[PDB]
Write a protein that binds this ligand. Structure first.
Ligand SMILES: CC(C)(COP(=O)(O)OP(=O)(O)OC[C@H]1O[C@@H](n2cnc3c(N)ncnc32)[C@H](O)[C@@H]1OP(=O)(O)O)[C@@H](O)C(=O)NCCC(=O)NCCS
Ligand SMILES: CC(C)(COP(=O)(O)OP(=O)(O)OC[C@H]1O[C@@H](n2cnc3c(N)ncnc32)[C@H](O)[C@@H]1OP(=O)(O)O)[C@@H](O)C(=O)NCCC(=O)NCCS
Ligand SMILES: CC(C)(COP(=O)(O)OP(=O)(O)OC[C@H]1O[C@@H](n2cnc3c(N)ncnc32)[C@H](O)[C@@H]1OP(=O)(O)O)[C@@H](O)C(=O)NCCC(=O)NCCS
Ligand SMILES: CC(C)(COP(=O)(O)OP(=O)(O)OC[C@H]1O[C@@H](n2cnc3c(N)ncnc32)[C@H](O)[C@@H]1OP(=O)(O)O)[C@@H](O)C(=O)NCCC(=O)NCCS
Ligand SMILES: CC(C)(COP(=O)(O)OP(=O)(O)OC[C@H]1O[C@@H](n2cnc3c(N)ncnc32)[C@H](O)[C@@H]1OP(=O)(O)O)[C@@H](O)C(=O)NCCC(=O)NCCS
Ligand SMILES: CC(C)(COP(=O)(O)OP(=O)(O)OC[C@H]1O[C@@H](n2cnc3c(N)ncnc32)[C@H](O)[C@@H]1OP(=O)(O)O)[C@@H](O)C(=O)NCCC(=O)NCCS
Lengths: 121, 121, 121, 121, 121, 121
């Protein structure tokens, strides 16, 4: 698993005071990029993203955790699922899934051509 | 038809010298956010993204243009397609589609509740 | 014409909750940079800026549109006028000019020396 | 155990092509802020930082991982140690500690007054 | 006499490896904003900018210093001149003016109405 | 002395509306980096930071001044003390020290090896 936690500050929000969607997309892609690089052990690029759902808003000041997991491997491509959870700090409240999405990354050689990646296990 | 043009500087690239995918996603979402806002004439939020394909890399120093177009409207939701073209500077040089994706946005009232939007004209 | 639209988020504002002036200047220059590159079909640099007027404040959450237009051409230099309009979203309200300014850009060769640009039409 | 992983892109480097020290410090503080927040279950602020050592440089394109661990607890204060490791991509390649530092954070009430935190378990 | 010094890193450059003009403009405005604020002892806004000349390029890795000086005062307005010098590191190396511009700022009350400022001493 | 002034905008704050600690650390390091480069007259890197104390919060909209001063010199290393003062604008209020810290920088040759710096005076 690949994890990244972020406090949500004003600079990452929209005018409503919630985490901007473009920002969550960038963080998820970064997370997928890291998980894919770890598996392929070489340079990778994002080629596709699908089914990204923004289920619940992320308020200013929330702590969110991104978790990326390799779901399947083809030959040079990898599909990574990324989830974003907001973890409440005040006792009582519980963590909830704010967003989730899938990304397909491709490993490439120094020439930039698709390169084979190890199978998953 | 919403349009945004950006010069690609070092700050928006990955370590390969090409436009980082996360930045591409954020710019597209922002494009769709503006297009949806103008059609709904209300506050809008991104609820879904799908079929985002990164066909060709965008080199450092490229001039990129994002074009967002409203494709369909439901009741409170709108599907916007966003394309990203790199517009070569050199005379007679190319001009190609680098990426494209779809986003679904929902208009909401001041209470944050989904609100209906005008029909697709 | 060269156009760019931006939603105004907290990260681009000053402590008053309005678009920071330094940010509008950077966006206008970027717009002029793009319009000039498109005309010259080569690398350009900003050499001068004049008469930038900030007529009305741009509130947090506003949608602004930047429009850059080539106004005159010398030999290697180009003068581009940039306007920034805020486009209200709520029915009733109308668009207003928030700021406007002029920029002079110069095309340069690979050696960094001023290079001739096509005349305007 | 709080963890954050980041790819090192041009935007976070100094003119040498290595991760800028100021960015390292900001990421560590952010790591400690999250770890302290989760333990205190309250709003927290950084009051002190010490013994931050930059042992090895982090090259552009490296994958870095920050790990924050609560080391000791007083009454309202917590000392968190943060380490930053670069995780090589190449097969059989290295894996080293690039930096480490300690931060002291204090939990505060909504009034901004220091509040006690749970004991160290 | 307001002063700000900045190291020029990749994140603030254009694709040529020199300090981006938009960033220069934002830094100058910020310099003038601070100088005007200290003289007016009130909230201030930028209303006009003129005669900004980019005389020499600022290479990646340069140390730049901005100096803002109050030149004249009207009733509620102030004209501040901002200069940007690159301070070479190498022994006996140069030291030159890279850019200069003028900004006009206006002090305003909490209502946002122009307020008078002290005379120029 | 090396000085840098900054207005505190939303983008540099935490969710409490005060200057984020990670940001003050980055600004102090930048300040130390500049002061050290000026003394060594060559490339430098941050190797150590100690005793950074955050004494008082810095509110949104405050003007802060960073002052870096070379305190001692070894052979290739330099210790710089950095202070951050907030300078009130409204008559009556006075400036106060918000934070202070020490940094050790090392000059290096083109090969990246520690290089001797002139003694202090
Ligand atoms: C990545 C790239 C080189 C692939 O080009 P290509 O001609 O499709 O290469 P191939 O046809 O050999 O396909 C390579 C792999 O990617 C997969 N793939 C390519 N396009 C895809 C798409 N849009 N959706 C899903 N998978 C895709 C293929 O299925 C194949 O997987 P496999 O080897 O497991 O079978 C090209 O699409 C590209 O350069 N895109 C831009 C990448 C980028 O700039 N990203 C943003 C910056 S991080
Ligand atoms: C939509 C939301 C506000 C609550 O409503 P909901 O119960 O999820 O959805 P509703 O049943 O109210 O339906 C709202 C509309 O969105 C559509 N919708 C909701 N979830 C969707 C998804 N994952 N994919 C596609 N469309 C979706 C519905 O089909 C409906 O469209 P319609 O009115 O045209 O028929 C909630 O998803 C939300 O707050 N999400 C977070 C948004 C956000 O923070 N985004 C990033 C910040 S910009
Ligand atoms: C800077 C670096 C090359 C020094 O390595 P080194 O093996 O310690 O080198 P040396 O042992 O010759 O020490 C060089 C000097 O640094 C000082 N120094 C080294 N480590 C130190 C530490 N953690 N605390 C204080 N001073 C330290 C030494 O005392 C010596 O000073 P002196 O010449 O005045 O006596 C190495 O630590 C490094 O590359 N660190 C990463 C720097 C970086 O990436 N910073 C962030 C980006 S700006
Ligand atoms: C702590 C603060 C809130 C006021 O309290 P204070 O009078 O300084 O400290 P207190 O006497 O109330 O003690 C609070 C705790 O912090 C600790 N502390 C305070 N100053 C410290 C320092 N410089 N080094 C180490 N610990 C320190 C105390 O030991 C005490 O710990 P304990 O309860 O476990 O025994 C004040 O320092 C503050 O507001 N600082 C600015 C914080 C900030 O803006 N940081 C950056 C933004 S995230
Ligand atoms: C652009 C630059 C090379 C021009 O230098 P120069 O010695 O003035 O070159 P020239 O005298 O040949 O003038 C070139 C053109 O620029 C115009 N120009 C130069 N300085 C100007 C100024 N301050 N105001 C308006 N136009 C100006 C000239 O009129 C001429 O236009 P023309 O060919 O249509 O007649 C030099 O000023 C420079 O490098 N500046 C820094 C650019 C930069 O870093 N910008 C920020 C980063 S994008
Ligand atoms: C100034 C403003 C507040 C409304 O006042 P106004 O009607 O434009 O100007 P006023 O007639 O009230 O005069 C105010 C002062 O500004 C000066 N001024 C206004 N427009 C100016 C311009 N374009 N050029 C030079 N000075 C100008 C006036 O000469 C006067 O100076 P004085 O009192 O010393 O004689 C309005 O221009 C404003 O809100 N602009 C937007 C500011 C902003 O958002 N900037 C970017 C964010 S920091």
């Amino acid at each position: 698993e690949t994890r990244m936690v972020y406090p949500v500050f004003p600079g990452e929000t929209n005018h409503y005071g919630t985490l901007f969607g473009g920002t969550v997309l960038a963080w998820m892609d970064q997370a997928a990029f890291v998980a894919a690089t770890r598996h392929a052990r070489k340079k990778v690029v994002t080629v596709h993203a699908d089914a990204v759902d923004f289920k619940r808003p992320v308020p200013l000041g929330a702590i969110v955790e991104l978790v990326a997991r390799l779901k399947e491997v083809g030959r040079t491509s990898m599909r990574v699922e990324v989830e974003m959870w907001v973890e409440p700090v005040k006792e009582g409240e519980e963590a909830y899934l704010a967003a989730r999405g899938g990304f397909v990354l491709v490993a490439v050689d120094e020439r930039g051509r698709p390169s084979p990646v190890p199978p998953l296990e």
